[PDB]
Design a protein. Structure first.
Lengths: 137, 350, 49, 48, 161, 182, 40, 58, 183, 133
RNA sequence: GAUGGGGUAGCAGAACGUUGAGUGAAUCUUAGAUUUUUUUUUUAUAACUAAAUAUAGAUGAUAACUCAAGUGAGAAUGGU
């Protein structure tokens, strides 16, 4: 008699079969008054129009935010957000920061420990002392 | 206020509508991003993708909602996942075949697929919300999608008096996943197990609708590719869905049915007997062939665990990792079809 | 005190305490919801300006 | 064109229209501080 | 150690000797049977359909049995008429004609006696209480070890143990 | 759902190192148990802790409405023959709660207050040192037995959720190498 | 604290304590702790 | 295979797949010149309410 | 990471090994010819092989922090092999911090009070890492003077034949020939 | 091109017929033992790649199954297998501060390091049929 | 497919921060300015995101650039 368990679901592997860009939305906030927003205003007029055209899968919302530094807040599919203050950064420095949010994921920063990350079992099962030629002390 | 003009121009009689108008979808940056995030074909306009986000809980109209789009899509997902599992694991018991279906095209996985697409829900449905938001009402579970399953005459006595329900009857009466059929407003409250299920159901109908939309617009082949890329691309260990009762009897009944020699448990290896954590490697042999192997701490458990592994190997037999499905023939000019292995059925034991 | 009493009624609900039946606040010597003769009669000598 | 406030976000999500009815029923002020005066206890005592 | 790089060199384990014999003059395929437990997906040839062409001699060929643990025997010593006697005695006095008494007299397994007949309800409830009165004499340390034994068995059949 | 009273005593003429031992004695006990230990204590401050603990209980009953179900609770024990609840505190003491409304000392700590006075200690060689006369306060958090029953049910549930002990555990290998060692 | 003369406020809380414990009056939540508009 | 990119100095490079080999870089002052789908394109796509997939393919 | 995904139960299980201090060891002996001169493993050379098992350093999943060691049942410790005059000229020392309380004893005198099992424990003990796992690993060394011990049923087996028995090898190769009859 | 060995032409069908397969790809010489579906996190920012780019890995040191193992002398022939990855994005670590200091010297020089890492996803690992070759 | 990379005494260059002032009769703030905290992100002696608590319309705060210093403390048996 075999009884089915009803508490196990399938897991998704982004990239296998279909790929989905993690950055769902990017929020650009500028000040018409703050001096630190001089470079942001230049990025919204020259580099954002073409950058937003190359990433049709990202939602861009350009809204002002006076009395505040300029920030680039990116919302990701995992629910988290990453805000980068770009005060006193030239336009080309904003584009390098905006591409950082695009290529990035919501995951929190972690130290490099292991290159490979796998969820499938070993092709050659884990070692066992009872499945070999035996060891004689 | 004059100091805070409205960000989005909308008529005065907007919030009174169940959902935003169709033309509203043509000025929303969330849909344009959602359309490009899934690489949908340009044949699917934004007015159609906006209709896949309006659940029947928000718009009772047969149109403007997700009722019909999700119905056509559910049949495509359920069909492609069914044929693919019978061709890959043609010996799976019926019980495990229902859980595997519910593990791929069920409300739980589809909910994760909807959240993998960056689809954020709306608090309360209305004509003012962004068309790119999933609209539904978790407080009204009245709406129920139409399914091919029929209601059982003894359903009342089934839930109350614990009457027996067989597996062979679920393929006709029960739904596609083996479950039975038919099993002003104050928002000052908290979440409920009813809303959690109503919200999870709303996400599943959206994913299914996207397949129905791709079908009506792009065609059958495009819909199959979308299902094969987002749903079938997921990982599931079907070996973990097995729960055995008296596996030693089921194995004896299997060898008896297949004429194999009666199974005999032999002790391949052992160590630490008369200790706190011994190890007994018991292998069940049918004559001189090794059917299965199990290593446990108790002599009895090692024999039971070996019988399960011998039974899983029988049911989990796979002709190939990527076998051909019967739907591949109807595409066009395909290679001649080769008959697929059809098992007789799972073993019924004492 | 009113900032903390408004938070308990919002939280405790049916267990809101009967503050009117409590002891006085020795920090002032006043009862619940009662002013002081100096603060109720405004007998405080104010500057000329 | 203007700064997005917490009110605008609720309007997009649809929850604003539900906040107006509740606050109105309870008589609390919808957008504003209502017709309530400022703290005067210290002022009446000659507070600088 | 001081850095992670040094810690990695001290905790190193070399690869299996089969991989160390890297080939020369070209590519080759070597037979490398690992010393591990095979998965339930390596279906034995005995469980492969007669149509499956993948059936083939051992890949090793392309380049007494162990001790018995459980070999039961089935016996049928009860006739169709004796089954009627088992149902009469069990209902006449379920205390004297217990399953162990009938199992001995009729030379059958104790389970088989239970299959033909069951004791009257009030007698079954008496059995469940006897085991319930002994479960209350268990302290917090024994009653917890018994619940684990009942959960490890459930976990074993769920593929967890 | 659970009543609670945070009562801060008055300024007692004692130190923290002296009164702390009196607060750790009544910790976890019932108001009645604590009062009996203060009546028969040899410490001078036990007389002030007994008066301050009777005031706290008066406030817990009038303002918070605690310990006002003894008559009703007693009816369910004997009249209906209901067996009381058996729990075990975090420290491990087993209790039999016949009245879920009984008040007890959930938490208790001591805080130091202002300085009573200053006495000069005149030593030899014409040296003088100041001696600070301390004053301390005590804070007791009175709760009902409904809290100890709930907290107990959470611990036993947390223990049954950690799974049983398995003989051969699947311990992980915490090191990745780009090759097979077996 | 044991030598402080009991004031009129402490002589009233002792009379209520004997009334709630006796069963004459039934305890009820406070209604004048704060004048909120929600009234919940 | 390279997804669409924006070269800060040249312009928007359309998607190119070297498996079938075309890196075309379009630069301009209007959304149409860039070679992407504009709001106007989405409006004409939504007005073609008559196009329908072939029944044989459906 | 896939290499470590699976059932690590049997990799961490304790295996009960066995070795006799009198059986010649062609590997752990300094004499290799003639075969009739092959001696057993000397005291220190046997202790170096045992310390490797107690640490689990013979396993491909070894980790110094994890106690992945095994048991080693040593028999015939009375005929423990030693070279030269170690048996009568080697000395073991002891001091309890009290000046004048220096305790000395030779190997032959220590083998009379606590048998050869204590001489093998001090050797293995000094070859183990000086940490908090030294007492657990050493406790898994079962040393006995003769052929009898309470672990004759714990010794690892392969088809009923204890490792080191006459026909244990052919019993292992016979079980692996059947494991190849599968995909 | 150099013809494949006759011994590899007869056992490769048996290698691809088994359930699972693994490979040891070599990116810039460094090996990575991966399986179809794994996620490789390279310790460097691959220049000139955006999330969604598909890469074809052509340097494999070992491509083996449970029992069989294919080994090339420098590497395996590309015509035997086909491995592809997809660029998933770039990740960064937390800032680490290193304090370079000497005894009896107040100056503490700080070194701030925050590296980026390219993340891949092995979406294809299949062995080809070389019956014709 | 540029070259270079430890450092005391010591020399040199480039910056941040603190306090006050100018632009400033400027800019922003119950659609939450400010909140000694917590949290998030960014090559970061710094700012930023968000949360929690309290409630200000200026004797409030403030970008940018510049000006002037009672301008940066684990070390003086230092002082309070
Ligand atoms: Mg004097
Ligand atoms: Mg150097
Ligand atoms: Mg230098
Ligand atoms: Mg704050
Ligand atoms: Mg100092």
């Amino acid at each position: 008699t075999v009884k089915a368990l009803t508490q196990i679901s399938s897991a998704g592997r982004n990239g296998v079969g279909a790929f989905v860009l993690q950055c769902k939305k990017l929020d650009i906030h500028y000040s018409d008054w703050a001096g630190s927003s001089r470079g942001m205003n230049g990025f919204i007029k020259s580099l954002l129009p073409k950058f937003a055209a190359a990433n049709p899968q990202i939602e861009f919302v350009v809204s002002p935010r006076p009395a505040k530094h300029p920030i680039l807040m990116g919302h990701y599919i995992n629910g988290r957000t990453k805000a980068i203050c770009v005060r006193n950064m030239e336009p080309l420095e904003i584009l390098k920061k905006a591409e950082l949010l695009r290529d990035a994921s919501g995951e929190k920063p972690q130290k490099f420990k292991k290159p490979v990350t796998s969820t499938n079992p070993s092709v050659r099962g884990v070692w066992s002392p009872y499945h070999g030629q035996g060891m004689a002390v | 206020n004059d100091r805070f003009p409205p960000l989005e121009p909308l008529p005065p009689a907007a919030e009174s509508l169940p959902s935003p108008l169709p033309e509203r979808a043509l000025t929303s940056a969330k849909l344009a991003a959602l359309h490009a995030r899934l690489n949908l074909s340009p044949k699917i306009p934004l007015q159609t993708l906006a209709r896949t986000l309006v659940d029947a809980s928000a718009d009772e109209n047969p149109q403007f909602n997700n009722a019909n789009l999700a119905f056509v899509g559910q049949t495509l997902i359920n069909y492609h996942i069914a044929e693919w599992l019978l061709c890959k694991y043609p010996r799976l018991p019926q019980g495990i075949l229902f859980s595997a279906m519910k593990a791929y095209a069920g409300p739980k996985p589809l909910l994760q697929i909807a959240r993998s697409w960056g689809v954020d829900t709306a608090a309360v449905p209305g004509g003012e919300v962004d068309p790119g938001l999933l609209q539904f009402d978790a407080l009204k579970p009245g709406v129920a999608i139409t399914n091919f399953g029929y209601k059982r005459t003894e359903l009342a006595y089934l839930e109350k008096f614990k009457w027996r329900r067989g597996m062979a009857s679920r393929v006709v009466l029960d739904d596609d996943f083996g479950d039975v059929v038919r099993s002003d407003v104050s928002y000052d409250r908290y979440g409920n197990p009813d809303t959690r299920a109503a919200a999870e159901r709303a996400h599943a109908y959206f994913v299914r609708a996207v397949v129905g939309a791709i079908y009506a617009h792009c065609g059958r082949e495009a819909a199959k590719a979308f299902v094969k890329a987002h749903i079938m691309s997921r990982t599931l260990d079907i070996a973990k869905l097995f729960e055995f009762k008296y596996p030693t009897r089921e194995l004896a009944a299997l060898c008896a049915r297949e004429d194999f020699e009666p199974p005999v448990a032999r002790l391949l290896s052992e160590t630490g007997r008369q200790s706190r954590t011994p190890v007994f490697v018991v292998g069940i042999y049918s004559g001189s062939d090794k059917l299965g192997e199990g290593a446990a701490s108790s002599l009895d458990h090692a024999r039971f665990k070996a019988a399960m592994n011998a039974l899983k190997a029988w049911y989990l037999y796979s002709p190939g990792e990527n076998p051909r499905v019967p739907s591949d023939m109807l595409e066009e000019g395909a290679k001649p079809w080769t008959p697929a292995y059809i098992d007789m059925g799972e073993v019924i034991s004492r | 005190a009113a900032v903390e009493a408004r938070n308990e009624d919002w939280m405790l609900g049916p267990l809101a305490p009967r503050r009117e039946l409590d002891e006085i606040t020795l920090s002032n010597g006043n009862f619940f919801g009662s002013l002081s003769p100096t603060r109720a009669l405004l007998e405080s000598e104010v500057s000329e300006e | 064109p203007r700064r997005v406030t917490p009110v605008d976000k609720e309007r997009m999500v649809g929850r604003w229209k539900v906040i107006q009815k509740e606050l109105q029923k309870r008589e609390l002020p919808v957008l504003g501080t209502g017709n309530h005066g400022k703290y005067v206890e210290l002022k009446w005592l000659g507070s600088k | 150690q001081s850095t992670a790089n040094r810690t990695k060199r001290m905790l190193n384990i070399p690869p299996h000797e089969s991989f160390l014999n890297v080939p020369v003059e070209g590519d080759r395929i070597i037979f490398n049977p690992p010393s591990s437990e095979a998965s339930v997906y390596h279906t034995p040839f005995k469980f492969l359909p007669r149509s499956d062409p993948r059936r083939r001699a051992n890949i090793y060929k392309l380049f007494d049995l162990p001790p018995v643990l459980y070999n039961p025997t089935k016996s049928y010593n009860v006739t169709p008429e004796q089954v009627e006697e088992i149902r009469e005695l069990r209902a006449k006095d379920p205390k004297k004609y217990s399953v162990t008494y009938l199992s001995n007299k009729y030379n059958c397994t104790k389970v088989f006696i239970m299959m033909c007949t069951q004791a009257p309800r009030e007698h079954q409830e008496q059995h469940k209480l006897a085991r319930a009165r002994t479960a209350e004499n268990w302290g917090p340390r024994r009653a917890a070890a018994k619940l684990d034994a009942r959960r490890r068995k459930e976990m074993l059949h769920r593929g967890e143990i | 759902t659970e009543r609670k009273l945070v009562y801060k005593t008055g300024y007692l003429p004692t130190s923290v190192k002296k009164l702390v031992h009196l607060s750790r004695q009544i910790r976890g006990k019932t108001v009645s148990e604590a009062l009996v230990q203060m009546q028969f204590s040899k410490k001078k401050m036990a007389k002030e802790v007994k008066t301050e603990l009777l005031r706290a209980e008066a406030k817990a009953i009038v303002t918070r409405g605690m310990g006002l179900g003894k008559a009703a609770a007693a009816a369910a024990q004997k009249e209906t023959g209901a067996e009381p609840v058996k729990i075990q505190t975090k420290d491990g003491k087993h209790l039999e709660i016949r009245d879920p409304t009984r008040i007890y000392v959930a938490e208790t700590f001591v805080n130091k207050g202002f300085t009573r006075g200053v006495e000069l200690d005149y030593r030899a060689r014409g040296r003088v040192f100041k001696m600070n006369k301390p004053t301390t306060t005590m804070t007791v958090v009175l709760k009902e037995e409904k809290t100890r029953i709930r907290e107990h049910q959470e611990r036993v549930a947390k223990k049954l959720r950690q799974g049983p002990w398995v003989h051969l555990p699947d311990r992980p290998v915490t090191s990745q190498r780009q090759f097979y060692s077996w | 604290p044991s030598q402080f003369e009991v004031t009129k406020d402490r002589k009233a809380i002792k009379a209520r304590q004997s009334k709630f414990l006796s069963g004459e009056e039934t305890w009820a939540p406070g209604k004048v702790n704060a004048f909120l508009n929600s009234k919940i | 295979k390279q997804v669409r990119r924006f070269i800060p100095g040249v312009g928007v490079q359309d998607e190119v797949d070297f498996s079938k080999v075309g890196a075309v870089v379009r630069d301009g002052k209007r959304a149409g010149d860039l070679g992407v789908r504009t709001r106007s394109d989405w409006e004409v796509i939504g007005k073609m309410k008559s196009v329908l997939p072939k029944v044989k393919a459906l | 990471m896939s290499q470590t995904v699976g059932a690590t139960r049997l990799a961490y299980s304790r295996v009960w090994h066995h070795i006799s201090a009198v059986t010649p060891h062609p590997t752990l002996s300094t004499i290799k010819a003639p075969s009739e001169a092959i001696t057993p493993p000397s005291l220190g050379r046997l202790a170096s092989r045992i310390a490797t098992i107690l640490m689990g350093k013979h396993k491909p999943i070894w980790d110094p922090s994890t106690d992945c060691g095994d048991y080693v049942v040593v028999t015939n410790c009375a005929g423990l092999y030693t070279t030269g005059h170690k048996k009568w000229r080697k000395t073991y020392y002891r001091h309890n911090t009290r000046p004048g309380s220096l305790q000395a004893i030779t190997m032959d005198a220590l083998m009379e009070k606590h048998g050869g099992a204590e001489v093998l424990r001090k050797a293995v003990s000094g070859m183990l890492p000086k940490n908090r796992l030294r007492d657990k690993r050493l406790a898994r060394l079962k040393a006995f003077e003769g052929d009898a011990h309470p672990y004759k049923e714990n010794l690892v087996r392969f088809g009923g034949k204890v490792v080191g028995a006459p026909g244990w090898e052919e019993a292992v190769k016979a079980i692996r020939e059947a494991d190849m009859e599968r995909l | 091109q150099p013809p494949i060995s006759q011994q590899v032409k007869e056992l490769l069908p048996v290698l691809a017929a088994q359930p699972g397969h693994y490979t040891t790809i070599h990116i810039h010489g460094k090996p990575y033992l991966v399986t179809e579906g794994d996620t490789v996190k390279l310790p460097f920012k691959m220049p000139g790649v955006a999330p969604g780019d598909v890469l074809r890995l052509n340097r494999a040191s070992v491509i083996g199954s449970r029992d069989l193992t294919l080994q090339g002398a420098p590497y395996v022939d590309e015509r035997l297998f086909e491995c592809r990855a997809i660029v998933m994005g770039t990740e960064s670590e937390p800032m680490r501060v290193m304090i370079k200091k000497k005894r009896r010297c107040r100056k503490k020089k700080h070194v701030f390091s925050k590296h980026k890492y390219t993340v891949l996803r092995i979406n294809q690992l299949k062995i080809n049929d070389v019956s014709s070759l």
